Design a protein around this ligand. Structure first.
Ligand SMILES: O=C(c1cc(-c2cc3c(cc2C(=O)N2Cc4ccccc4C[C@H]2CN2CCOCC2)OCO3)n2c1CCCC2)N(c1ccccc1)c1ccc(O)cc1
Length: 137
């Protein structure tokens, strides 16, 4: 249902593993499992991109816009929405690692606005998140 709830719960889970208690049900567990399979799949290139990412408060919004525009340029699919969430999380984990944790709240806002403004039509026309729950899990 609520896109804002889905991003809050995904980010809270990734940060809690890092020992960072950020302050801010079937779908949440299905999304969390797909993104973990996505990390295992491209673990090689995930290490490279982590260092390649030069994240600061002055570049985050622009970095976010560029990568999201590249992901969905050739259309939307669930595999790209999964990569959308993993990029949202890698930037949150990276913010915490670099002692810029205030940016977590900005990244979650950018993810929520993009889901509601640019992914809402596609998802609903796919039947909503239950359609995602049927592919994964
Ligand atoms: O540039 C990117 C990136 C990653 C993918 C992507 C999305 C997918 C997928 C696959 C890939 C993909 O193409 N890769 C995954 C990946 C994951 C982590 C780090 C690097 C890469 C690069 C390659 C891996 N190789 C490339 C050759 O063909 C496939 C194998 O399967 C399902 O959805 N895409 C892009 C750009 C737009 C096309 C799809 N990031 C990016 C962003 C910033 C800096 C560098 C790369 C990015 C976006 C979202 C993410 O969640 C992670 C990375």
């Amino acid at each position: 249902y609520d896109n804002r709830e889905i991003v809050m719960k995904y980010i809270h889970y990734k940060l809690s593993q890092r020992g960072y208690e950020w302050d801010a049900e079937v779908v949440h567990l299905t999304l969390r499992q797909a993104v973990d399979d996505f990390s295992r799949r491209y673990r090689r290139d995930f290490a490279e991109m982590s260092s390649q990412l030069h994240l600061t408060p002055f570049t985050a919004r622009g970095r976010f816009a560029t990568v999201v525009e590249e992901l969905f340029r050739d259309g939307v699919n669930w595999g790209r929405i999964v990569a959308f969430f993993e990029f949202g999380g890698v930037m949150c984990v990276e913010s915490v690692n670099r002692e810029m944790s205030p940016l977590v709240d900005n990244i979650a806002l950018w993810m929520t606005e993009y889901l509601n403004r640019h992914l809402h039509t596609w998802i609903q026309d796919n039947g909503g998140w239950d359609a995602f729950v049927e592919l994964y899990g």
